[PDB]
Amino acid sequence: SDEINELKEMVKDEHIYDKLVRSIAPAVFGHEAVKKGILLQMLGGVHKSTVEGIKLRGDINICVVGDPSTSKSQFLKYVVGFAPRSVYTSGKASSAAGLTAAVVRDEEGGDYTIEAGALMLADNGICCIDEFDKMDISDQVAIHEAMEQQTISIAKAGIHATLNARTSILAAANPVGGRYNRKLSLRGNLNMTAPIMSRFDLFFVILDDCNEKIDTELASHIVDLHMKRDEAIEPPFSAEQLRRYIKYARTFKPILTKEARSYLVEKYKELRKDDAQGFSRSSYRITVRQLESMIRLSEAIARANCVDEITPSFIAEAYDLLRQSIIRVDV
Amino acid sequence: RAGDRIEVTGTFRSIPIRANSRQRVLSLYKTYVDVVHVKKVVRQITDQDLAKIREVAAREDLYSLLARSIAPSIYELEDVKKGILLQLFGGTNKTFTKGGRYRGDINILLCGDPSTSKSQILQYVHKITPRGVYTSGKGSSAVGLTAYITRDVDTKQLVLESGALVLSDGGVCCIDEFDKMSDSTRSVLHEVMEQQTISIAKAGIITTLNARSSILASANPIGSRYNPNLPVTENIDLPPPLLSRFDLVYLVLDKVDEKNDRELAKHLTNLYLEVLPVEFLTMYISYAKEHIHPIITEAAKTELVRAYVGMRKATTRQLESMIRLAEAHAKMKLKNVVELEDVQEAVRLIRSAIKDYATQTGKSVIQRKLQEDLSREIMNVLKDQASDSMSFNELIKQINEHSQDRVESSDIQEALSRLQQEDKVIVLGEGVRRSVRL
Amino acid sequence: CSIIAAANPNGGRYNSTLPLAQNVSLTEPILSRFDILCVVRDLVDEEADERLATFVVDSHVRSQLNARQRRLQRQRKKEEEISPIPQELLMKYIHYARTKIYPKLHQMDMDKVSRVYADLRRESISTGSFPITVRHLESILRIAESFAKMRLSEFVSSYDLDRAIKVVVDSFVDAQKVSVRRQLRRSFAIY
Amino acid sequence: EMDSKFSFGQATPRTLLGIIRLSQALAKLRLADMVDIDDVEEALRLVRVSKESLYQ
């Protein structure tokens, strides 16, 4: 066809990294930091790893906390139709099953049967759960088990089960008071325990302000949308030609081949001496766990621009993306 | 269909039965009747009704004419009568091809004084809609709503009957007891508030079936009243997310009120001794709620941005759904396009919503006053010892003595759990502790 | 059955200076049904930090009859960079390292351990963090003959005892207090 | 009163319509068709002993 030839024309463009980020969602304005991150979550990274042993990480997992009834809820509406087979669950029913995995009682010929829930059917699916504060104190290690590697285990009144929910989660919790303080860190305002945050990636929390200008332009931004028909806004791509485009993007495997790994190691070695502000400073010490994300995002951004190897120029946006958001942590 | 009052015009017959299942042996017979005729006890749209309502549509006071028609016995109370017919005039599905999928349905609620025809109004709304629901006192539940496994007496197999929220495909969900509802449920209505669907995780099958729905809420107080000169939100124990899942709320008022309760006694003095139709207005709206899909001109958006620039002197959720109700008021009478000035009383109704929160949920004054105060004393305690020994008998003393602005014992539990995560203290039961070192 | 575990303190590794009853929520007697407490430490380094950092980056670089064996020959060099004795066969003899050989002991190489149990229990009751009992010394000789089973030998040497001593005594004392430095002044008397 | 010490009731017509109901009820057992003030004083005769049954 010519649509299969349309990709070959569209792969020979230049600013598609900047063309795509403007053409994500018409229901949002601005926030160009978090628009970059969700697109990398929309694609997949790499999963092939070392031999005879550990299977490493396969994806990234990003959250954004913010004040409720704001533009945080629009991406959650956006992704669940935009993504392949991706389910959405509030994650409030923390009693029977679902988020927590728990078998059913003896019915019609047997107990110990497997059950559904929004992790098992997210096998290469991008599930999205919100409202971290209102769950119980037991599941916060259960999904923490589900995050570090890609399998979960169960032995509740039956034999051990070897199931591997190949997942990539998306989160949006709530702050401790609904309004985010500025002079402090989010170590108080994370409203959870410590090691799941270090198990997580970084966030780019959405800020808030009441200015005379931004409310006026957002008012004009919403009325033509809330028109029955004012389709004067032009995304420079359509939905489905973007959808088949990433289906071409997933069929590579770029490998770092240059000697910028020697350039890479000094940056983290400089980085670890910053967030540790003392020998008795807090245990949010960004350790060797994050080095895997420090390269597996770094290949995925080059997997967006269809380049099969890693340059030291491409990891410039990789270093600061934690670092501009870790200085959001570090005051 | 099964389950109705019935009359039959039947003849009579009788049949034999075999006693053993495999012989020709037979003797106590069984009778049965054979019916000849049975009796219980897109509408055909004419044009005289459309001509009749256009006389009423020529009358400008149709809002006031529908204000007086909804109350055959109820006291006047003009403010509650606005949104009820407006929710009954439940917009349309202004759906785009790509992006959006917004629907103009909104959600009103009410709470306040007990038994002010809170149920009979809901019964009156059940009259005006033919295909609707009716909630019960634990007739439905969390697992009792949908997602069934039930071993029926005819075949002992699976059956998936829909819940009431899916069952209102073409009606208005009337539902109650939203302060005594269990917290195993009151967790899936957020999804039908948001994705308009019910996700079923049952042993049978998975299904993301939608639910074209429309809701109103009839809550109840807890102690005695709506407790004025207090924050009214802390009475109704409720997740502060779902406060944002209602556009405009309103309470009712109460007082001694000797000029009005005397007048309200004169109403019940009457109505006992010795056009306001019942279905003719129902065909008037159920024609209009699918034929006319009106467009908006620029003449509304200029005043619309003038409200928000005066509003900032919530952000967008309150500012969005007002158009979803300003459309329906224009869709009520002038069934072509928007009206440039019917928004000027649509802003009056939501002005009554923000009159109810003059005086947590959406408020941060208390948080600011509390945390700063909490920070001083902890630092002084940390400074005072070679070790980090802060026992329970110490902290009940001096801390309580400090300032009598905070409560006695309802600030001694939650003062540490938020401070647990900020490298300060640890919990070792109702007693000894261990604090921060340097 | 055998039991391993993956314990996790309430936050950081040094959640207190005080003993391990203040650190873990697990109480005393169930904790005493184990043999040893492997504890990790990582504060601040450069040359030990790169020794992980330059190491782990190369691991991610590890991503027809002849060609079936040429891929099998490719399987050799991918795990034999520095050639650390590959796992094609090393697991293949553990199965009869466990069901074919049984070890025994001697008697002339015993009473050096007598003061080891007695003095260290004495040194940790006046300084009581968590105690040792009759079962720790039972675990002392047990992991001693574990090493000698890997010589496929049925005996117990002299080299294996002090090896097995100097993996338990240091791994007990190195979780005490600020006063681990004073205990290390006793440590080389064992060696 | 407005107190949480003893009593209930906060002046609703839902309390009022009961005494309208039982008035014609006592007029039914005592039919002389004398629905007047003397009939309804028997009604308030029975509601004053309804409340303050706890005041001893």
UniProtKB/Swiss-Prot annotation, chain B:
Subcellular location: Nucleus
Role noted for this protein: Acts as a component of the MCM2-7 complex (MCM complex) which is the putative replicative helicase essential for 'once per cell cycle' DNA replication initiation and elongation in eukaryotic cells. The active ATPase sites in the MCM2-7 ring are formed through the interaction surfaces of two neighboring subunits such that a critical structure of a conserved arginine finger motif is provided in trans relative to the ATP-binding site of the Walker A box of the adjacent subunit. The six ATPase active sites, however, are likely to contribute differentially to the complex helicase activity.
Complexes and interactors: Component of the MCM2-7 complex. The complex forms a toroidal hexameric ring with the proposed subunit order MCM2-MCM6-MCM4-MCM7-MCM3-MCM5; loaded onto DNA, forms a head-head double hexamer.
Top-rank taxon: Eukaryota
Chain location of the short sequence motif Arginine finger per the record: 244-247
Chain ranges of the MCM domain: 62-269
Residues annotated as binding ATP: 112-119
Protein name, as recorded: DNA replication licensing factor MCM4
Native organism: Saccharomyces cerevisiae (strain ATCC 204508 / S288c) (Baker's yeast)
Family of the protein in this entry: Belongs to the MCM family.
Additional record remark: Present with 8800 molecules/cell in log phase SD medium.
Curated annotation (Swiss-Prot), chain C:
Covalent S-S links between cysteines: none
Coiled coil segments of this chain: none
Motif Arginine finger: where in chain: 32-35
Location(s) in or outside the cell: Nucleus
The protein's assembly and partners: Component of the MCM2-7 complex. The complex forms a toroidal hexameric ring with the proposed subunit order MCM2-MCM6-MCM4-MCM7-MCM3-MCM5; loaded onto DNA, forms a head-head double hexamer.
Similarity comment text for this entry: Belongs to the MCM family.
Function according to Swiss-Prot or TrEMBL: Acts as a component of the MCM2-7 complex (MCM complex) which is the putative replicative helicase essential for 'once per cell cycle' DNA replication initiation and elongation in eukaryotic cells. The active ATPase sites in the MCM2-7 ring are formed through the interaction surfaces of two neighboring subunits such that a critical structure of a conserved arginine finger motif is provided in trans relative to the ATP-binding site of the Walker A box of the adjacent subunit.
Additional free-text comment from the UniProt record: Present with 1690 molecules/cell in log phase SD medium. Early fractionation of eukaryotic MCM proteins yielded a variety of dimeric, trimeric and tetrameric complexes with unclear biological significance. Specifically a MCM467 subcomplex is shown to have in vitro helicase activity which is inhibited by the MCM2 subunit. The MCM2-7 hexamer is the proposed physiological active complex.
Listed name of the protein: DNA replication licensing factor MCM2
Organism this protein belongs to: Saccharomyces cerevisiae (strain ATCC 204508 / S288c) (Baker's yeast)
Residues of the whole record sequence present: 644 to 864 of 868
Curated annotation (Swiss-Prot), chain D:
Highest rank taxon of the organism: Eukaryota
S-S pairs: none
Subcellular location: Cytoplasm; Nucleus
Positions annotated to bind ATP 2: 14
Binding partners and assembly: Component of the MCM2-7 complex. The complex forms a toroidal hexameric ring with the proposed subunit order MCM2-MCM6-MCM4-MCM7-MCM3-MCM5; loaded onto DNA, forms a head-head double hexamer. Interacts with CSM1 and MCM10.
Known function: Acts as a component of the MCM2-7 complex (MCM complex) which is the putative replicative helicase essential for 'once per cell cycle' DNA replication initiation and elongation in eukaryotic cells. Core component of CDC45-MCM-GINS (CMG) helicase, the molecular machine that unwinds template DNA during replication, and around which the replisome is built.
Family (UniProt): Belongs to the MCM family.
Note: Present with 166 molecules/cell in log phase SD medium.
Name by which UniProt lists this protein: DNA replication licensing factor MCM7
Organism whose genome encodes this protein: Saccharomyces cerevisiae (strain ATCC 204508 / S288c) (Baker's yeast)
Gene name of the record: MCM7
Full-length numbering of the shown residues: 674 to 729 of 845
